[PDB]
Write an enzyme that holds these catalytic residues in place. Structure first.
Site, PDB file in Angstrom:
ATOM      1  CG  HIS A  41      43.017  43.243  42.848  1.00 17.83           C
ATOM      2  ND1 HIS A  41      43.298  41.933  43.185  1.00 17.83           N
ATOM      3  CD2 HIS A  41      43.919  43.661  41.926  1.00 17.83           C
ATOM      4  CE1 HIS A  41      44.331  41.586  42.433  1.00 17.83           C
ATOM      5  NE2 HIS A  41      44.743  42.596  41.664  1.00 17.83           N
ATOM      6  N   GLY A 136      51.077  42.931  35.928  1.00 21.38           N
ATOM      7  CA  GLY A 136      50.256  42.580  34.781  1.00 21.38           C
ATOM      8  C   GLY A 136      49.897  41.105  34.688  1.00 21.38           C
ATOM      9  CB  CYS A 138      46.594  40.176  38.655  1.00 18.94           C
ATOM     10  SG  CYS A 138      47.746  40.672  39.958  1.00 18.94           S
TER      11      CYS A 138
HETATM   12  C1  LIG Z   1      48.026  42.504  39.879  1.00 21.51           C
HETATM   13  O1  LIG Z   1      46.701  42.941  40.244  1.00 21.51           O
HETATM   14  C2  LIG Z   1      48.365  42.923  38.468  1.00 21.51           C
HETATM   15  N1  LIG Z   1      47.982  44.051  38.041  1.00 21.51           N
HETATM   16  O2  LIG Z   1      49.031  42.182  37.770  1.00 21.51           O
HETATM   17  C3  LIG Z   1      49.096  43.082  40.818  1.00 21.51           C
HETATM   18  C4  LIG Z   1      50.452  42.376  40.622  1.00 21.51           C
HETATM   19  C5  LIG Z   1      51.538  42.890  41.568  1.00 21.51           C
HETATM   20  C6  LIG Z   1      52.840  42.112  41.405  1.00 21.51           C
HETATM   21  C7  LIG Z   1      53.530  43.383  40.916  1.00 21.51           C
HETATM   22  C8  LIG Z   1      52.216  44.149  41.022  1.00 21.51           C
HETATM   23  N2  LIG Z   1      48.682  42.841  42.204  1.00 21.51           N
HETATM   24  C9  LIG Z   1      48.340  43.793  42.975  1.00 21.51           C
HETATM   25  O3  LIG Z   1      48.300  44.972  42.616  1.00 21.51           O
HETATM   26  C10 LIG Z   1      47.965  43.409  44.390  1.00 21.51           C
HETATM   27  C11 LIG Z   1      46.595  44.010  44.720  1.00 21.51           C
HETATM   28  C12 LIG Z   1      46.789  45.017  45.848  1.00 21.51           C
HETATM   29  C13 LIG Z   1      48.278  44.991  46.215  1.00 21.51           C
HETATM   30  N3  LIG Z   1      48.904  43.963  45.375  1.00 21.51           N
HETATM   31  C14 LIG Z   1      50.153  43.489  45.460  1.00 21.51           C
HETATM   32  O4  LIG Z   1      50.474  42.453  44.880  1.00 21.51           O
HETATM   33  C15 LIG Z   1      51.123  44.218  46.366  1.00 21.51           C
HETATM   34  N4  LIG Z   1      51.431  43.381  47.523  1.00 21.51           N
HETATM   35  C16 LIG Z   1      50.999  43.619  48.699  1.00 21.51           C
HETATM   36  O5  LIG Z   1      50.302  44.613  48.931  1.00 21.51           O
HETATM   37  N5  LIG Z   1      51.350  42.786  49.597  1.00 21.51           N
HETATM   38  C17 LIG Z   1      50.983  42.844  51.013  1.00 21.51           C
HETATM   39  C18 LIG Z   1      49.466  42.803  51.168  1.00 21.51           C
HETATM   40  C19 LIG Z   1      51.544  44.085  51.705  1.00 21.51           C
HETATM   41  C20 LIG Z   1      51.544  41.622  51.729  1.00 21.51           C
HETATM   42  C21 LIG Z   1      52.398  44.743  45.675  1.00 21.51           C
HETATM   43  C22 LIG Z   1      53.208  45.582  46.658  1.00 21.51           C
HETATM   44  C23 LIG Z   1      53.302  43.606  45.204  1.00 21.51           C
HETATM   45  C24 LIG Z   1      52.030  45.659  44.505  1.00 21.51           C
HETATM   46  C25 LIG Z   1      45.965  43.748  46.092  1.00 21.51           C
HETATM   47  C26 LIG Z   1      44.463  43.973  46.114  1.00 21.51           C
HETATM   48  C27 LIG Z   1      46.499  42.652  47.017  1.00 21.51           C
END
Ligand SMILES: *[C@](O)(C(N)=O)[C@H](CC1CCC1)NC(=O)[C@@H]1[C@@H]2[C@H](CN1C(=O)[C@@H](NC(=O)NC(C)(C)C)C(C)(C)C)C2(C)C
Ligand SMILES: *[C@](O)(C(N)=O)[C@H](CC1CCC1)NC(=O)[C@@H]1[C@@H]2[C@H](CN1C(=O)[C@@H](NC(=O)NC(C)(C)C)C(C)(C)C)C2(C)C
EC number: 3.4.19.12
Lengths: 298, 301
Positions: A41, A136, A138
Site C-alpha cells: 500500500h 509511520g 508500517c
Molecule cells: C501505515 O501504512 C504507515 N504509513 O505507517 C499506516 C499506519 C496507520 C496507523 C496510523 C496510520 N497504515 C495505513 O495507512 C493503513 C493502510 C490503509 C488504511 N490504514 C489504516 O491503518 C487505517 N485503518 C483502517 O482503515 N482500518 C479499517 C480497514 C477501517 C478497519 C487507519 C484509519 C488507522 C489510518 C491500508 C491499506 C489498510
C-alpha cells in the site's frame, strides 16, 4: 531470578531497516540481500494496475544516509519486493516463517527507517497483535532468533478500530481474515492462550510464587469444558507434551497445574498477584519460559 | 495507538559486549573505545568474598591474568585500574563498533533498557525502572554480572547501570558506569537487605495520562485535590510523595489531555480507595509505575 517480558536482541534486524518512499507515503522496508520488502500500500483498489504505472525511479529507498538504486519491482501478495543494485552487507542468517496463533515474537518498531523500540508480542488467537504502532510504523517487522538464524514472521500493515494491529508474514499473506483496504473490518472475539498461561504459572513456581498450587488434578476433557466457559483456547495433548520439561523441573503434573488454573478462573486471584501481575498472563510460550529461566543466548 | 513496555533497540549495545575471565569467575564486560568495564568482584575468589580488600587483590594481578574475549577474538589487556566498584581493563584494540555514548547516573523512578548477557552473548532485552529503594526488578541468572542498563534517546547511548548482585528478595543491585552503587549496597557477601519499596507516583500519573490518550476514561472523576492532601493519602498506600517538580513535568500531558494534574491526582486517590472493580487500564489490573512522563510522550507522540 526475576521474570520480564523479554524481547530478542534486535541488532541483526536493525541492520536491515531502510526508509521507502513512493509519492507522499513514507514507510519502512526490510533490506535482505538485494531485495527491499515493504507493504504494497506504499503505492496508494487495484494494486496490479497501480504497480504497472510505477517506474523503478518512483521508489525512493534510503538506507541511513545512502540512497539505494531500485532496478526492479514485483508484488508477492500484499508485500512489494524492490530489487536494488546493492546486496545488504549486514544481511544476517535468516528465513521467512509463518507463525501459528499463540506464538510470540519481538517487534522492532521503526519510523523513517530508524528503529525506535523493541517489545514482545503474541499472535492472538483472533490473528491480531496488540502492538504499539503510530503513523509511520508500517513495514516494521516481527521476528524470533534461534541460534544465529533470524526468523522473520510479521510485517506491520494496518490498525483496526479497537486499536489492535494487523499485518502479514514476509511472503505478503495476511494473518487472519484481513485485507489491505479501506473497507469495514473488525477483529473477531479474542480468546486466552491456555498453553501460555500454564507456561507462565510454571515460571511463577520456578521463581518461588506457589500460593495457587493445590493437591488436585483433572483430565484434559474436564479442563477443556471449563476452558470453553472462560473463552480460553482448548489445550491439546501436543500442548501437554510441550509443557513436559517444565512439569518435570517443578514436580507439578500438567493436569495438576490445570486444576490450579481452573480454580483461578472460577475464583479469581482474591487480591493476590502472580509474578507481579493481577491477571493471568498469556504472552509467554513454554519455550520463552525455558529460554528465560535458563539464560539461552544468541 | 497501543501501549507496550518498550525497550530501546539493543544493537548499539550488543556490539560492546565481551566475556571477561579472571580465575574461575567469568562474567560480561562493556568494551567502549580501548577500555573494557566490568564489576571489580571478578578478581575475588570464593575463599574471600565477605571482606575483600580489592586494592590488595588487584595489586597481585598481572595484565595476562585477565582473559577478555570479544566473540572468537581474544583481546590483549595492557593495563588495569579500579574506579570504585568497577574494573577498567585497558586493551590493545579500540572497539570498531563503539557507538556515540556517555555515562549518566540516574535518579529513582527513571527507566532504562537492560541487555541481559551470559558469557559475552546477549540473551534478551527488557525495560526496568530504578526503584525508590535503589534496587531494580530485573531478570538475571548466574553469569549475568556486567550486563548493562541504558537509554538511546537521540542516537547516543547513555549507559546508566551495570549489574553486580542479587538481594535476598530476588531483586537486583548494581552501579552506574563510574562504579558507584545505587543505594546503600556494597559488593560484599555481608547481610544486606533492600529497604521497604514504594510506588513511583509520578510514573503512575503518567501512565493514567497514557490511558486517557489511548481513549480510556472510566477512572476519571469530578473531584480535585490539593497537593498536600494527595500526599497525605498516597503515603498511606506506600506511594512516593509527589513534588511540585513532578507536577511541572506532568504539564505537557495535562495540556494534551485537558486534565489538570491535581484532577488526575484525585482520580488516582479514588483508584487507590476502590481498586479496579474487574476493569483494566491499558491491559493491566494493577497501577503501572515503570513508565515515566518522558516514556509516555516518546511512545504516544
Ligand atoms: C501505515 O501504512 C504507515 N504509513 O505507517 C499506516 C499506519 C496507520 C496507523 C496510523 C496510520 N497504515 C495505513 O495507512 C493503513 C493502510 C490503509 C488504511 N490504514 C489504516 O491503518 C487505517 N485503518 C483502517 O482503515 N482500518 C479499517 C480497514 C477501517 C478497519 C487507519 C484509519 C488507522 C489510518 C491500508 C491499506 C489498510
Ligand atoms: C555475578 O558476579 C556473576 N558471576 O554473574 C554474580 C551474580 C550471579 C551469581 C548468582 C547471581 N554476582 C555475585 O556473585 C555477587 C557477588 C558476590 C555474591 N553475589 C551475589 O549476587 C549473591 N548475593 C548476595 O550475596 N547477596 C547478599 C549480599 C547476601 C544480600 C548471590 C548469593 C546471589 C551469589 C558479590 C561480591 C556480592
Amino acid at each position: 531470578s526475576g521474570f520480564r517480558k523479554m524481547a530478542f536482541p534486535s541488532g541483526k534486524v536493525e541492520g536491515c531497516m531502510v526508509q521507502v518512499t513512493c509519492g507522499t507515503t513514507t514507510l519502512n522496508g526490510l533490506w535482505l540481500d538485494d531485495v527491499v520488502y515493504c507493504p504494497r500500500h506504499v503505492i496508494c483498489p487495484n494494486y496490479e494496475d497501480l504497480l504497472i504505472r510505477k517506474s523503478n525511479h518512483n521508489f525512493l529507498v534510503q538506507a541511513g544516509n545512502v540512497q539505494l538504486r531500485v532496478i526492479g519491482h514485483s508484488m508477492q501478495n500484499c508485500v512489494l519486493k524492490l530489487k536494488v543494485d546493492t546486496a545488504n552487507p549486514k544481511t544476517p542468517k535468516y528465513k521467512f516463517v509463518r507463525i501459528q496463533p499463540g506464538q510470540t515474537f519481538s517487534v522492532l518498531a521503526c519510523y523513517n527507517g530508524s528503529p525506535s523500540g523493541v517489545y514482545q508480542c503474541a499472535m492472538r488467537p483472533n490473528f491480531t497483535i496488540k502492538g504499539s504502532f503510530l503513523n509511520g510504523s508500517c513495514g516494521s517487522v516481527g521476528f524470533n532468533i534461534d541460534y544465529d538464524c533470524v526468523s522473520f514472521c510479521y510485517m506491520h500493515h494496518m490498525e483496526l478500530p479497537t486499536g489492535v494491529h494487523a499485518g502479514t508474514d514476509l511472503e505478503g499473506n495476511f494473518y487472519g481474515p484481513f485485507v489491505d483496504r479501506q473497507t469495514a473490518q473488525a477483529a473477531g472475539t479474542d480468546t486466552t492462550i491456555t498453553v501460555n498461561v500454564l507456561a507462565w504459572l510454571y515460571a511463577a513456581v520456578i521463581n518461588g510464587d506457589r500460593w495457587f498450587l493445590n493437591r488436585f488434578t483433572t483430565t484434559l476433557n474436564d479442563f477443556n469444558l471449563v476452558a470453553m466457559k472462560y473463552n480460553y483456547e482448548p489445550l491439546t495433548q501436543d500442548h501437554v507434551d510441550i509443557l513436559g520439561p517444565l512439569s518435570a523441573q517443578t514436580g507439578i503434573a500438567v493436569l495438576d497445574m490445570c486444576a490450579s488454573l481452573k480454580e483461578l478462573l472460577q475464583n479469581g486471584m482474591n487480591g493476590r498477584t502472580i509474578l507481579g501481575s493481577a491477571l493471568l498472563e498469556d504472552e509467554f510460550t513454554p519455550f520463552d519460559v525455558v529460554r528465560q529461566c535458563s539464560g539461552v543466548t544468541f
